[PDB]
Design a protein around this nucleic acid. Structure first.
Length: 114
RNA sequence: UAUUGACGACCCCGAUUGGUUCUACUACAAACG
């Protein structure tokens, strides 16, 4: 198939990780209102990612001590610009179907998330 | 469908009262037989 879209390149965050993912915008798409609730949740979650390892990042560790062959995930080393959910920022959305509608629970920077 | 694979310390003082109340001129020598 031929597709187009964007690449959600994070980094080699895990030792078994081989691939980045790219968002096949060429096809089906669904738009959902961005509430202020999801905005604060993102900022709080991304603050958590960036603050938790601040000591490890500042002392110059290239990746988390507990996972070998791996480097900081994009959201951790990214700036506070990442912490603000600005126009065209890429995400994973945690979603379910209810009342016949796609409810969105959270926005997450990675597949298996904090 | 649930796998990948182990490492790692943190806290270092925090909150508050920071003046309160009384004495603020008193007798005199000059006035007045």
């Amino acid at each position: 198939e031929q597709f187009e879209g964007f690449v959600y390149k994070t980094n080699k965050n895990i030792g078994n990780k081989h691939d980045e993912r790219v968002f096949i915008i060429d096809r089906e798409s669904i738009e959902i209102p961005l509430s202020r609730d999801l905005r604060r949740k993102w900022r709080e979650l991304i603050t958590s990612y960036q603050e938790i390892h601040k000591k490890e990042v500042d002392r110059g560790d290239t990746g988390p001590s507990a996972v070998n062959g791996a480097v900081w995930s994009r959201q951790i080393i990214a700036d506070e610009s990442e912490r603000n959910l600005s126009d065209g920022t890429l995400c994973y959305a945690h979603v379910k179907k209810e009342d016949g509608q796609y409810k969105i629970l959270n926005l997450y920077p990675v597949m298996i998330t904090r």
